[PDB]
């Protein structure tokens, strides 16, 4: 059982390293152990199945049952396991599973399902997070992407502007916190400037979507 | 006289599975056929209206998209 | 043009007894000044079989609506049980928040609501005629359905 | 790779294949033409238009069935019912 958590950590480190095949192998072994022990529905398999589906999505993306199909299966199982549990951690993990389902849908050229999954993730995130969370910006960005792919360019620029809006709100909140905090005078400004570096490419996406 | 259907029972089962349904009742087939007929009636009425306004004799995919935009769009949240 | 956007809806006083009024904290936004009237409505679906058993619990008519963000608590009385078919009383049904501009409905928010008994004896052996004083209403607020319709905003 | 069993896969939503259309073309097209004829009109439908109608109907029904299965998950039902379909229609903004 401890080896399953070791496999999970190894797979996460491999995904961050960029060795997607090794990450897929480790996550697959961990998911196999958890499913053979607790059952392919129990709560202990949630994170394992989620990371398995995420690694399968990374594999499919690098390559550019099928990888996208198996990723959808694992992520939807994980989404079920998370949604059935009524805690904040589980709900945010279910939102992440929805986000990964939407990304798998984008890679599968199924943009309607992609916009549905991104909307579900955003609903969970907005009801369990604060209005200046970087995750909300990320989800709005993915949603605008899906809108642009689906030729809904008005909604695309709307979602991109919403991501910009939440980024700027977080910038203002962090400026307030760096002004009203004592002993942490640099991390907030560094994160502000990181978001400022992120902003212009989102504006370029706005322009590109306006171009259609 | 004519009970012409446009969708088959295997197709209904495949769509239910894509929706995530695990078990369907017997009346699900007739219910699904009825709702599909209502939807098609509304969309076809709007598309034929657009086509007859445009004074064309053949409804095109653009006519269909224009009619579909009139049906209303369901989102799974407010920020989307 | 999408001149009015419902940014959020928060279900208050949930769960609650069936007889408790619906309370929705609605936050919307007007892109510009509105020359005509907005009308909010709460609609209870007393029967999935027929729309004839929809009860408009309450309606709020405002106008003109100025530009900017607005937030208000729409409160409506519980549906009349005498009009609800007994078979549709216990179980899942739908509540709706409709908004209308210039007579045209442009947004329809929908929630599943689960009316059930709290006493386990009543849950296991439900009475022949539903006891709404013992029913508890639980609005499935975490899964809203917002349906946007295209209207002429002039 | 490791895949979950079939019993587990019955619990999730079947993965959508991009190319596949779930509604067969010929009887659907006959239904479309029958409705058009019922509208007292001699218009013919292009293949692009009937394919757009097919895809629209498929997406409409799959979303409807998702919300039907949600409604049935609540009220603790294993099998979905016409009442579940009707409640899904109602909650998805559909109006007579």
């Amino acid at each position: 059982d401890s080896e399953a958590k070791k496999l999970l950590g190894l797979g996460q480190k491999h995904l961050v390293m960029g060795d997607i095949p090794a990450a897929v192998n480790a996550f697959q072994e961990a998911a196999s152990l958890l499913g053979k022990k607790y059952g392919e529905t129990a709560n202990e398999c949630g994170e394992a199945f989620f990371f398995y589906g995420k690694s399968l999505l990374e594999l499919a993306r690098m390559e550019n049952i099928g990888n996208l199909e198996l990723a959808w299966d694992m992520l939807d199982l994980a989404k079920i396991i998370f949604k059935r549990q009524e805690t904040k951690e589980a709900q945010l993990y279910a939102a992440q599973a929805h986000l990964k389902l939407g990304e798998v849908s984008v890679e599968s050229e199924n943009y309607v399902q992609a916009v549905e999954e991104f909307q579900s993730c955003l609903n969970l995130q907005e009801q369990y997070l604060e209005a200046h969370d970087r995750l909300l910006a990320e989800t709005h960005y993915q949603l605008g992407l899906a809108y642009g792919y689906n030729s809904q360019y008005d909604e695309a620029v709307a979602q991109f502007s919403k991501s910009i809006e939440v980024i700027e709100n977080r910038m203002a909140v962090l400026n307030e916190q760096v002004k009203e905090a004592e002993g942490s005078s640099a991390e907030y400004k560094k994160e502000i400037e990181e978001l400022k570096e992120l902003l212009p490419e989102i504006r370029e996406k706005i322009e590109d979507a306006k171009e259609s | 006289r004519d009970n012409i259907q446009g969708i088959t029972k295997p197709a209904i089962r495949r769509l239910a599975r894509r929706g995530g349904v695990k078990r369907i009742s017997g009346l699900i087939y007739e219910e699904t056929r009825g709702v599909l007929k209502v939807f098609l009636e509304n969309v076809i009425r709007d598309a034929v209206t657009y086509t007859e306004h445009a004074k064309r004799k053949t409804v095109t995919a653009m006519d269909v998209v224009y009619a579909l935009k009139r049906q209303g769009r369901t989102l799974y949240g407010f920020g989307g | 043009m999408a001149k009015v956007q419902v940014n959020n809806v928060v279900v208050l006083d949930n769960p609650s007894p069936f007889y408790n009024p619906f309370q929705f904290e609605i936050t919307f936004e007007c892109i510009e000044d509105l020359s005509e009237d907005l009308e909010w409505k709460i609609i209870y679906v007393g029967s999935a079989e027929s729309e004839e058993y929809d009860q408009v619990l309450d309606s709020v008519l405002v106008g003109p609506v100025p530009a900017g963000r607005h937030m208000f608590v729409f409160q409506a009385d519980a549906p009349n049980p005498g009009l609800i078919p007994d078979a549709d009383a216990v179980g899942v049904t739908v509540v709706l928040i409709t908004c209308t501009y210039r007579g045209q409905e442009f947004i329809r928010v929908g929630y599943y609501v689960n009316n059930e008994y709290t006493e386990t004896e009543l849950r296991e052996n439900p009475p022949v005629k539903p006891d709404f004083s013992k029913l508890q209403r639980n609005i499935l607020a975490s899964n809203p359905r917002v349906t946007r319709f295209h209207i002429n905003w002039e | 790779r490791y895949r979950p069993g079939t019993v587990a896969l019955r619990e999730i939503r079947r993965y959508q294949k991009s190319t596949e259309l779930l509604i067969r073309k010929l009887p659907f097209q006959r239904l479309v033409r029958e409705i058009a004829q019922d509208f007292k009109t001699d218009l013919r439908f292009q293949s692009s238009a009937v394919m757009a109608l097919q895809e629209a109907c498929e997406a409409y029904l799959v979303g409807l069935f998702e919300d039907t299965n949600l409604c049935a998950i609540h009220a603790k039902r294993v099998t979905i019912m016409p009442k579940d379909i009707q409640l899904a229609r109602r909650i998805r903004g559909e109006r007579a």
Side-chain angles (χ1 to χ4, degrees), chain A residues 1-5 7-35 37-178 181 183-188 191-206 208-212, chain B residues 2-54 56 58-80, chain C residues 2-154, chain D residues 1-39 41-96:
Chain A
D1 182 288
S2 185
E3 79 154 335
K5 306 189 285 184
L7 262 357
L8 268 182
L10 285 172
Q12 300 195 66
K13 205 202 90 63
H14 276 120
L15 210 159
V16 181
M17 278 312 291
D19 199 320
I20 294 159
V24 175
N25 288 27
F27 286 144
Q28 154 245 125
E29 240 292 342
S32 321
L33 281 155
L34 270 304
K37 189 195 174 44
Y38 297 108
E40 308 185 321
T41 298
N43 299 336
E44 300 81 13
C45 305
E47 316 192 11
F49 292 174
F50 168 79
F51 282 113
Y52 190 19
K54 179 184 182 186
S55 57
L56 293 163
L57 172 59
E58 294 277 62
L59 195 55
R61 284 216 88 194
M62 183 169 47
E63 289 180 342
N64 268 327
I65 315 189
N67 277 339
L68 286 174
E69 179 176 15
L70 193 61
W72 172 272
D73 294 349
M74 304 313 304
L75 292 164
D76 214 52
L77 266 179
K79 178 225 58 180
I80 281 175
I81 299 164
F82 292 148
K83 269 295 295 183
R84 74 157 170 257
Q85 310 173 39
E86 306 196 345
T87 56
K88 166 181 187 176
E89 276 71 33
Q91 291 309 292
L92 289 184
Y93 246 115
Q96 279 304 300
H98 267 303
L99 172 85
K100 283 311 173 296
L101 287 169
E103 290 176 3
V104 165
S105 295
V106 174
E107 286 299 323
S108 309
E109 293 186 60
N110 309 321
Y111 306 143
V112 183
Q113 273 290 352
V115 80
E116 177 188 313
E117 302 307 309
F118 291 143
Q119 281 169 0
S120 294
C121 165
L122 176 72
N123 171 75
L124 286 174
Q125 277 175 343
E126 279 189 351
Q127 79 185 12
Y128 276 100
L129 292 180
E130 305 198 5
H132 66 307
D133 209 306
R134 208 183 346 92
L135 298 170
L136 300 171
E138 303 171 3
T139 308
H140 281 296
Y141 182 77
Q142 295 300 324
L143 201 36
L145 255 61
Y147 278 132
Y149 279 71
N150 200 20
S151 300
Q152 306 187 258
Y153 304 99
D154 287 330
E155 300 88 334
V157 311
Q159 289 301 301
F160 291 139
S161 68
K162 281 174 172 287
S163 62
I164 288 181
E165 200 162 23
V166 53
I167 280 160
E168 287 171 347
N169 177 29
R170 165 164 268 256
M171 284 189 196
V173 173
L174 285 187
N175 196 310
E176 194 283 326
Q177 291 193 0
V178 80
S184 310
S185 53
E187 268 192 343
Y188 300 145
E191 188 178 2
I192 293 179
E193 285 298 75
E194 180 190 341
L195 303 175
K196 208 191 205 306
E197 299 147 15
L198 231 27
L199 178 145
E201 179 259 317
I202 295 180
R203 266 178 219 281
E204 154 182 10
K205 281 300 189 159
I206 296 197
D208 202 2
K210 262 175 179 174
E211 196 185 349
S212 305
Chain B
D2 61 86
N3 282 342
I4 300 301
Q5 318 291 356
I7 185 156
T8 67
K9 301 189 160 77
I12 291 174
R13 284 179 237 116
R14 297 189 300 260
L15 292 170
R17 278 282 319 142
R18 256 187 65 183
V21 181
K22 213 167 61 178
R23 212 165 310 172
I24 60 151
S25 154
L27 304 320
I28 286 293
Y29 293 124
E30 203 174 27
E31 185 70 29
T32 307
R33 290 207 165 123
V35 305
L36 176 66
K37 180 163 165 167
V38 177
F39 177 79
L40 266 175
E41 260 164 16
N42 288 310
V43 177
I44 281 173
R45 177 171 38 82
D46 291 347
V48 171
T49 295
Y50 271 102
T51 300
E52 294 181 312
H53 183 271
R56 181 53 217 170
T58 288
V59 285
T60 59
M62 204 51 58
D63 289 345
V64 163
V65 179
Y66 272 120
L68 284 172
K69 294 291 295 177
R70 284 206 137 199
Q71 275 306 118
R73 202 185 112 206
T74 289
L75 309 80
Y76 297 73
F78 294 86
Chain C
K3 287 210 192 163
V4 180
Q5 280 168 354
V6 177
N7 313 138
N8 200 261
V9 169
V10 167
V11 179
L12 313 170
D13 189 23
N14 192 32
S16 57
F18 173 92
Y19 284 143
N20 264 31
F22 288 92
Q23 316 189 36
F24 304 95
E25 176 188 294
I26 306 172
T27 295
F28 66 101
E29 178 158 44
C30 298
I31 292 309
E32 65 176 41
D33 281 359
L34 290 180
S35 310
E36 312 274 7
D37 299 349
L38 284 187
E39 190 183 28
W40 304 89
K41 298 203 221 179
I42 297 178
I43 306 170
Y44 194 83
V45 175
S47 180
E49 280 66 69
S50 184
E51 192 194 313
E52 294 181 344
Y53 307 91
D54 287 8
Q55 302 189 33
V56 179
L57 313 179
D58 208 6
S59 188
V60 190
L61 176 66
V62 302
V65 195
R69 164 199 150 274
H70 303 297
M71 177 211 298
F72 78 102
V73 175
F74 197 171
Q75 187 164 331
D77 281 0
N80 190 344
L83 313 166
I84 299 171
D86 291 352
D88 303 298
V90 180
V92 178
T93 191
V94 178
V95 70
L96 300 164
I97 304 165
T98 274
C99 197
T100 295
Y101 181 76
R102 193 173 168 61
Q104 322 160 86
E105 175 172 337
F106 63 96
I107 195 190
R108 187 171 201 107
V109 181
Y111 288 103
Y112 281 145
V113 13
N114 197 353
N115 311 285
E116 300 290 344
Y117 292 119
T118 37
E119 316 179 8
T120 39
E121 183 235 359
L122 284 179
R123 220 186 308 164
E124 269 182 353
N125 304 323
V128 191
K129 187 90 183 178
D131 194 332
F132 290 86
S133 69
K134 309 265 180 310
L135 286 171
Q136 158 170 286
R137 168 226 294 153
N138 186 20
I139 309 185
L140 182 57
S142 56
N143 299 76
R145 299 281 175 272
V146 298
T147 309
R148 303 206 270 98
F149 302 108
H150 287 1
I151 74 169
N152 191 347
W153 302 90
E154 169 73 12
Chain D
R1 318 219 158 286
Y2 155 74
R3 48 89 186 143
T6 31
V7 47
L9 285 197
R10 303 199 214 283
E11 290 267 350
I12 57 136
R13 309 180 289 177
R14 194 110 79 90
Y15 169 75
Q16 167 190 24
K17 315 274 197 115
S18 319
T19 46
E20 83 174 3
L21 286 194
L22 277 312
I23 296 186
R24 295 204 321 210
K25 187 196 168 286
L26 295 157
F28 181 82
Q29 167 175 23
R30 196 128 199 155
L31 181 65
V32 172
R33 291 197 274 95
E34 250 69 347
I35 299 185
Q37 279 200 298
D38 296 331
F39 277 148
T41 339
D42 57 352
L43 285 20
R44 181 193 59 91
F45 271 75
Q46 193 152 0
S47 281
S48 55
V50 306
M51 189 178 188
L53 280 187
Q54 251 177 296
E55 289 185 280
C57 293
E58 177 166 319
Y60 168 87
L61 289 178
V62 69
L64 196 51
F65 271 132
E66 284 176 332
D67 278 353
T68 303
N69 181 81
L70 181 54
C71 175
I73 282 179
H74 295 269
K76 313 186 177 184
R77 248 177 304 189
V78 290
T79 317
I80 69 168
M81 297 290 296
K83 188 193 217 201
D84 297 323
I85 287 195
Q86 287 149 1
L87 285 176
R89 295 221 301 168
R90 288 316 296 278
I91 195 186
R92 300 188 109 243
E94 296 186 31
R95 45 204 184 146

